[PDB]
Amino acid sequence: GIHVWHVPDLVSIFGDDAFFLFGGGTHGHPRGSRAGATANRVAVEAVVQARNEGRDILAEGREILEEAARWCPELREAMELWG
Amino acid sequence: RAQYEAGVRPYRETYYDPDYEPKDTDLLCAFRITPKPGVPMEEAAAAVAAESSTGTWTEVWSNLLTDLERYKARCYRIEGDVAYIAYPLDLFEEGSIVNIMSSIVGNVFGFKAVQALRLEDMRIPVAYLKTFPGPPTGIQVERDRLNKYGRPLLGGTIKPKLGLSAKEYARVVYECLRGGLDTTKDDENLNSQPFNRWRDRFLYVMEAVRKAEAETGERKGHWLNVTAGSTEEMLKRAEFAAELGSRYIMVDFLTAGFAAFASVRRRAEELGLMLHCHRAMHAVFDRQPNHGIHFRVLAKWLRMVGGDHVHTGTVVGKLEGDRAETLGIADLLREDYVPADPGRGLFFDQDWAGLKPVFPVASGGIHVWHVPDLVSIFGDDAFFLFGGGTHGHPRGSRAGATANRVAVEAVVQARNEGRDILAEGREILEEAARWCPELREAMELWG
Amino acid sequence: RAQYEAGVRPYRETYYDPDYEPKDTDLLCAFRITPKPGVPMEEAAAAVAAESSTGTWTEVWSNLLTDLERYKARCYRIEGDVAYIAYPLD
Ligand SMILES: O=C(O)[C@@](O)(COP(=O)(O)O)[C@H](O)[C@H](O)COP(=O)(O)O
Ligand SMILES: O=C(O)[C@@](O)(COP(=O)(O)O)[C@H](O)[C@H](O)COP(=O)(O)O
Numbered sequence: 001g002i003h004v005w006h007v008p009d010l011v012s013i014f015g016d017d018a019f020f021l022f023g024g025g026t027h028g029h030p031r032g033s034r035a036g037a038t039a040n041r042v043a044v045e046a047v048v049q050a051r052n053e054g055r056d057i058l059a060e061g062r063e064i065l066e067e068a069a070r071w072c073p074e075l076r077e078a079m080e081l082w083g
Numbered sequence: 084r085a086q087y088e089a090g091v092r093p094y095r096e097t098y099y100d101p102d103y104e105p106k107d108t109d110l111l112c113a114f115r116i117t118p119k120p121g122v123p124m125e126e127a128a129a130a131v132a133a134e135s136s137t138g139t140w141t142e143v144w145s146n147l148l149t150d151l152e153r154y155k156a157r158c159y160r161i162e163g164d165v166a167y168i169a170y171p172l173d174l175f176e177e178g179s180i181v182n183i184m185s186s187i188v189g190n191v192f193g194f195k196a197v198q199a200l201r202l203e204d205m206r207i208p209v210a211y212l213k214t215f216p217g218p219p220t221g222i223q224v225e226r227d228r229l230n231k232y233g234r235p236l237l238g239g240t241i242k243p244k245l246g247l248s249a250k251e252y253a254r255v256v257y258e259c260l261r262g263g264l265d266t267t268k269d270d271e272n273l274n275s276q277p278f279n280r281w282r283d284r285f286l287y288v289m290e291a292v293r294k295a296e297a298e299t300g301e302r303k304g305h306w307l308n309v310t311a312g313s314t315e316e317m318l319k320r321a322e323f324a325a326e327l328g329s330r331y332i333m334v335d336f337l338t339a340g341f342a343a344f345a346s347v348r349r350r351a352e353e354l355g356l357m358l359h360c361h362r363a364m365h366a367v368f369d370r371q372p373n374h375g376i377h378f379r380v381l382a383k384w385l386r387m388v389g390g391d392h393v394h395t396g397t398v399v400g401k402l403e404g405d406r407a408e409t410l411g412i413a414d415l416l417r418e419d420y421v422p423a424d425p426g427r428g429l430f431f432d433q434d435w436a437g438l439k440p441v442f443p444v445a446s447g448g449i450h451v452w453h454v455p456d457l458v459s460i461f462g463d464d465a466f467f468l469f470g471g472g473t474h475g476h477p478r479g480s481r482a483g484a485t486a487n488r489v490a491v492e493a494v495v496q497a498r499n500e501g502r503d504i505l506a507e508g509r510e511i512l513e514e515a516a517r518w519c520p521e522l523r524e525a526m527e528l529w530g
Numbered sequence: 531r532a533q534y535e536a537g538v539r540p541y542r543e544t545y546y547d548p549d550y551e552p553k554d555t556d557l558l559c560a561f562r563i564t565p566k567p568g569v570p571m572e573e574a575a576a577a578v579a580a581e582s583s584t585g586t587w588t589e590v591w592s593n594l595l596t597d598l599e600r601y602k603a604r605c606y607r608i609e610g611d612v613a614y615i616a617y618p619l620d
C-alpha cells in the first residue's frame with residue numbers, strides 16, 4: 001500500500017537494487033495513471049538524487065518531497081491526496 | 084479528462100452487501116477473521132473480500148472502465164467471528180486449482196488489518212466443478228483392480244525413513260507384503276538419495292512386489308515415490324514406474340505444488356497408474372485453529388484436480404486431529420452429496436456432480452490397539468497404514484504384518500456380526516489373540 | 531526548477547528610490563501625475579517609471595536572467611504633484 005509519501009522510507013531500506021511497485025498508488029492519482037506514474041517517478045528520483053548529496057533521507061524526506069512538488073504538479077497532487 | 088472521486092475509501096461501503104443472496108454459481112468462502120483492535124468485523128470482512136477480488140487500497144480511475152458489480156466479491160453474511168464471502172463464477176479460470184489458491188488465499192492473509200485469518204470451508208459450484216477431471220480411478224475401479232472387497236485395505240511405510248540401501252529396502256518390502264499387508268509405500272522424504280537412488284529402488288521393489296505377489300496368491304502393490312525437483316523429472320519417474328508393471332505412484336501433492344501435481348495426474352492416467360497423494364507439509368497450513376487453510380479445503384482441492392488417496396489422519400495416532408472434523412473430511416471425499424453439518428466443521432452443502440470418490444488414508448503412529456477406533460471412524464473404504472507398527476513387532480515385519488491383518492479381520496468380522504466395536508474392541512482383540520500368536524506379542528508390547 | 535516569488539507586487543517596492551543620485555548620462559523626465567483616488571502619489575510615480583522600463587504588472591521569472599538594477603528606471607524625487615524619473619542611458 002505504498003505511495004509517494006513512503007518513498008523516503010523505502011529508499012532508506014533497499015537502496016538502489018530494488019523494485020518499487022505502485023499499483024493503487026499510480027491509478028489512485030486523482031487525475032489518471034499517466035499523471036500518477038509521473039508522480040511516483042519524480043518522487044523516487046528526487047529522493048535518490050538527494051541521497052547522493054548526503055541529505056539524511058529519514059529526516060528530510062518531507063522537505064525533499066515538498067521541494068520536488070514545488071515544481072512538479074503531479075507529485076504535488078499525489079501528496080495532497082494521501083497522508 | 085473525465086473526473087472521478089479519488090481518495091482512500093473504506094472497504095465496507097462497496098464490498099459489504101448484507102442483503103446479498105448468492106446464486107448457485109458462486110464460490111462461497113467462510114473465513115475466520117481476527118481483526119486489529121478498533122477495526123470492526125464488518126470492515127475487516129470487506130478487506131478480505133476486496134483484496135481477493137477486484138479491490139485495492141484506493142479508488143482507481145479504471146474502476147469506471149468496467150462494470151465492477153459484475154466481478155466484485157462481497158461479504159454477504161457475518162456470524163460474529165466467521166465472514167461469508169461470495170465470489171462470482173467469472174473470477175476464476177476453468178480447470179485450475181492454482182487460480183483459486185492464488186486468489187482466495189493469496190495476499191489477503193498478510194494484511195496489517197487482520198491479525199489472523201483461517202479459511203474454514205468453501206462451496207465449489209457445479210458450474211465451476213464440472214471443468215475438473217476428478218480422480219482417475221476412484222474407489223470402485225480400484226477395488227476391482229486389486230480384487231479386494233469388504234474390508235479396509237492395509238498398508239505400511241518402510242522404516243527407517245532413510246538410510247536403507249536399495250537391496251535392503253526391497254527385503255523389508257517383501258516381508259511386509261508376504262506377511263499380509265495389501266500394499267507398502269515409500270516415505271515422503273525418500274526420492275533419489277545417494278544411499279538409495281530411484282532407478283535402483285524402483286527395480287528392486289517391483290522385484291519384491293512381484294515375488295511376494297506370486298507366493299501369497301493375491302494382488303500387491305507399492306506406492307513408489309515419483310516426486311522430484313521438477314515436473315519433467317517427476318513425469319520421467321512416473322513412466323519408469325509404469326513400464327515396470329507397477330499399479331501405484333505416490334506424489335507429495337503439497338510440497339511439489341498443485342501445477343506439477345495436475346501435470347503428473349494427467350500423465351499418470353494415460354499410463355494406467357493409480358496415484359496416491361501424500362499431504363506432506365499440510366500442518367504448516369492447518370495446525371493452529373486461528374490461521375491457515377483447514378484441511379477440508381485442501382481435501383476439496385485434491386478431489387477436484389484428481390487423486391486416488393489422501394491422508395485424512397488418524398485421530399488416535401501421533402498426529403493431531405479432531406474426530407468430528409475427520410469424519411466430515413472422510414465423508415467429503417467419499418460421498419456424492421455432503422449436506423452441511425455445523426457440528427462437524429462443515430459450512431456449505433457440497434454437491435460433487437459425478438466426480439468419483441477417494442480413499443481416505445489413515446496413517447500415523449497406529450498399532451494394533453487402535454484398530455477398533457479406526458474401523459468405526461472410516462469403515463471399509465479406507466487404508467490403514469501401519470508404518471512403524473509393522474516393523475516394530477518383536478519378531479520382525481512379517482510377524483507384524485500378520486498381526487495387523489488379523490486385527491483388522493477380527494474387528495471387521497465382529498462388526499458384521501453386530502457387536503459394538505467401541506465397547507468390545509479389547510474383548511475382540513483378545514479373542515483374536517487367543518489363536519493368533521503374532522497378534523498377542525504385538526497387542527501386549529504396545530498396550 | 532528555479533523558485534521565484536510570483537504574484538503581483540507593488541510598483542513602489544522595486545521602482546521607487548528616494549536615495550538615488552542621478553548620473554550625468556541618465557535621462558530625467560519630470561512627469562506631472564494625477565492618480566486615481568485611492569492610489570498613493572509615491573505609488574503611481576513608481577508605476578510610470580516601471581512601465582516605461584523593464585517592469586510590468588507581475589513578477590516574471592525572466593527578471594532573474596538580467597541584472598535588472600542596471601537597466602530599470604526609478605523615481606528619485608517627488609514634489610507632491612511632479613515626479614522625477616531617471617532612465618539609464620543603456
Ligand atoms: O496484489 C496486490 O495487492 C499488489 O499488486 C498490490 O497492489 P497495490 O500496490 O495497488 O496495493 C501486490 O502484489 C501485493 O502487495 C503483494 O503483496 P506482497 O508483494 O507483499 O506479497
Ligand atoms: O512418518 C511418516 O511420515 C509416516 O510414514 C508415518 O510413519 P509411522 O506409520 O511409523 O508413524 C506417514 O507419512 C505419516 O502418518 C504422515 O502423517 P499424515 O498421515 O498426517 O500425512
Ligand SMILES: [Mg+2]
Nearest residue numbers: 240269270271
Ligand atoms: Mg511418511
